[PDB]
Amino acid sequence: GSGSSARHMVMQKLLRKQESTVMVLRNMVDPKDIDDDLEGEVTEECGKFGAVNRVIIYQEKQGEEEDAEIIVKIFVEFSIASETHKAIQALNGRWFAGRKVVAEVYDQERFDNSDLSA
Ligand SMILES: [Cl-]
């Protein structure tokens, strides 16, 4: 036709999506060498990408044993999604002090339910 549906923004109010603003940063930290001020350090560093609402550092057990492996997962919630993705693109697949890190978007609902397992 003439693109009429787009031109009149037909049904646009139904089609809005909420975007996650949460980044998960993986493999950044050895679990045996965790800075006391890690949360603050991450907070300040991430200010190079956007307004940071909060940071949670989570030491995740990989099993139930007393000696189960620990993996450090760093969550950063930014004010807006464009900031989250700026941070992800600056970090993901890159090396820091001999560690190759993974940075990805994390589901907002899971984060807001304190489900830090993914
Ligand atoms: Cl991205």
UniProtKB/Swiss-Prot annotation:
Role: DNA- and RNA-binding protein, involved in several nuclear processes such as pre-mRNA splicing, apoptosis and transcription regulation. In association with FUBP1 regulates MYC transcription at the P2 promoter through the core-TFIIH basal transcription factor. Acts as a transcriptional repressor through the core-TFIIH basal transcription factor. Represses FUBP1-induced transcriptional activation but not basal transcription. Decreases ERCC3 helicase activity. Does not repress TFIIH-mediated transcription in xeroderma pigmentosum complementation group B (XPB) cells.
Intracellular or extracellular location(s): Nucleus
Positions of modified residues (N6-acetyllysine): 13
Disease: Verheij syndrome: A syndrome characterized by growth retardation, delayed psychomotor development, dysmorphic facial features, and skeletal, mainly vertebral, abnormalities. Additional variable features may include coloboma, renal defects, and cardiac defects.
Subunit and partners: Homodimer. Associates with the spliceosome. Found in a complex with RO60 and Y5 RNA. Found in a complex with FUBP1 and far upstream element (FUSE) DNA segment. Interacts directly with ERCC3. Interacts with CDK7 and GTF2H1. Interacts with SRSF11/P54. Does not interact with ERCC3 in xeroderma pigmentosum complementation group B (XPB) cells. Interacts with ARGLU1; interaction may be involved in ARGLU1-mediated modulation of alternative splicing.
Tissues of expression: Isoform 2 is expressed in colonic epithelium and colorectal epithelium cancer (at protein level). Isoform 6 is expressed in colorectal epithelial cancer but below detection level in colonic epithelium. Expressed in heart, brain, placenta, lung, liver, skeletal muscle, kidney, pancreas, spleen, thymus, prostate, testis, ovary, small intestine, colon and peripheral blood leukocytes.
Cross-link for Glycyl lysine isopeptide (Lys-Gly) (interchain with G-Cter in SUMO2), residue positions: 17
Miscellaneous section: Does not repress TFIIH-mediated transcription in xeroderma pigmentosum complementation group B (XPB) cells.
All copies of domain RRM, residue ranges: 21-108
Protein name, per record: Poly(U)-binding-splicing factor PUF60
Domain-related comment: The third RNA recognition motif, called PUMP domain, is atypical and may rather mediate homodimerization and/or protein-protein interactions.
Family membership noted in the UniProt record: Belongs to the RRM half pint family.
Highest taxon in the source lineage: Eukaryota
Lineage: Eukaryota, Metazoa, Chordata, Craniata, Vertebrata
